[PDB]
Amino acid sequence: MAKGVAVLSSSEGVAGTILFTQEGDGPTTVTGNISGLKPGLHGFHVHALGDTTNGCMSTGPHFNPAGKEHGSPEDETRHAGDLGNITVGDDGTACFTIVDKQIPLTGPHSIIGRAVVVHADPDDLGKGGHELSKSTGNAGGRIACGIIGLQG
Amino acid sequence: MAKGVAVLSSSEGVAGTILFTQEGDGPTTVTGNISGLKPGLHGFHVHALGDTTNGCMSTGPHFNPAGKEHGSPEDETRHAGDLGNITVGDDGTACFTIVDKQIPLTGPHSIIGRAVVVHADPDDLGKGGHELSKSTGNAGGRIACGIIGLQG
Ligand SMILES: [Zn+2]
Ligand SMILES: [Zn+2]
């Protein structure tokens, strides 16, 4: 049972905490609980780095060990870091649970030490018209992020 | 891979960072993220010099090794620095990527050590009919800038 936790920092409204859980090499479970977001859909990703020296900007692109194109968590075409959209409710609040099989807490593909980033806009899932669709799903700015710290 | 990074200063509350990237001698990709700006279109150019002894003002006109008049980035008649407009959203942030062929990161025409400047108003693109359309795109007003430094 490995465990991680990202405490979200933001310059805009955004607060919250995101817990990760992995038993053996079963899937990782990410349970998130967040506030200060515009109702609707927001991109949610594991970026490649946890360099926070320029805030969320310095955390690099989506965690992509497999060198693949951007997709939804449900695609075979997909970054590892692609957790899709989280649905923000009317009160600015999201409270979700995602189970994924590409964001391990242990080993050489570990996301421990990396950042999760919530985005201003919906993730395209690689399918919008846009120039950035197949690399970022064109989700706009990095509105909150925290480094995935090892938890006890 | 050549890399560049400009950190914005302003006396007007604009903040941001702008990244540049160029594989070998393909186009340069510029990815920026900026805050503290009036919503709507702002002209966005690479300027000739990286001289900030008098602020944004000492950075010269638009970067222009070919000696052309001002245009849109998609025109033949175009300064090298003619990067068009960025769109600032209702929160006063802009998050954007521009791919361009005339702003290299290496060689004689390299933009490294030059400045990138955000302007108060929209760029004309040379089509506004103003006496300054063919020079500044009537965007006029330097509201933040940053010298393009070498990145790791
Ligand atoms: Zn992705
Ligand atoms: Zn120009």
State how far residue A6 is from chain B, nearest Cα, in angstroms: 23
Return phi, psi of residue B56, to 5°.
Answer: -60, -25
Mode of pairing for the β-strands spanning B28-35 and B15-22: antiparallel
User: How many CB atoms lie under 10 A from the CB of residue B92?
Assistant: 14
Measured between alpha carbons, how far is B104 from B82 in angstroms, rounded to an integer?
Answer: 13
Experimental method: X-ray
Measured between alpha carbons, how far is A142 from B35 in angstroms, rounded to an integer?
Answer: 12
Number of structural domains in chain B: 1
As given in the structure block, the two tokens for residue A92 are 């600015």
List, as one string, the DSSP characters of A63-107: --TT------TT-SS--TTEEEEEEE-TTSEEEEEEEESS--SSS
Residues near B25 by beta carbon (within 8 Å), at least 6 away in sequence: B104, B106
Cβ-in-10-Å burial (0-12, 13-18, 19+) of A147 comes to buried
Helix (H, G, I), strand (E, B) or coil at B111: coil
User: Across-strand partners of A28?
Assistant: A22, A100
User: Across-strand partners of A40?
Assistant: A88
Mode of pairing for the β-strands spanning A2-7 and A142-150: antiparallel
Chain B contact set for A12 (CB, 8 A): 91
Q: How far apart are the first and last CA of chain B?
A: 10
Is residue B73 within 8 Å of residue B139, measured between CB atoms?
no
Q: What is the dihedral of CA B36, B39, B43, B49, to 10 degrees?
A: 0
Q: How many Å lie between the centroid of ligand 1 and the Cα of residue B99?
A: 19
List, as one string, the DSSP characters of A8-61: -B-SSS-EEEEEEEESTTSPEEEEEEEES--SEEEEEEEBS----TTTTGGG-S
Report resolution (Å) to 1 decimal: 2.4
Question: Which own/partner contact pairs does A12-17 have at CB distance under 8 Å and 24+ positions apart?
Answer: A12/A36, A12/A143, A12/A144, A12/B91, A13/A37, A13/A92, A14/A118, A14/A143, A14/A144, A15/A144, A16/A144, A17/A146
* Residue numbers of the domain that contains A45: 1-152
B68 secondary structure, DSSP code? P
Measured between alpha carbons, how far is A118 from A142 in angstroms, rounded to an integer?
Answer: 6
Q: Do A141 and B97 touch (CB under 8 A)?
A: no
Chain B residues in contact with chain A using a Cβ-Cβ cutoff of 8 Å:
17, 33, 35, 91, 93, 95, 97, 99
CA-to-CA dists, residue A136 to A71, A79, B2, B90, angstroms: 9, 9, 21, 22
Chain B contact set for A131 (CB, 8 A): 97, 99
Measured between alpha carbons, how far is A27 from A23 in angstroms, rounded to an integer?
Answer: 7
State how far residue B100 is from chain A, nearest Cα, in angstroms: 13
CATH code at position B112: 2.60.40.200
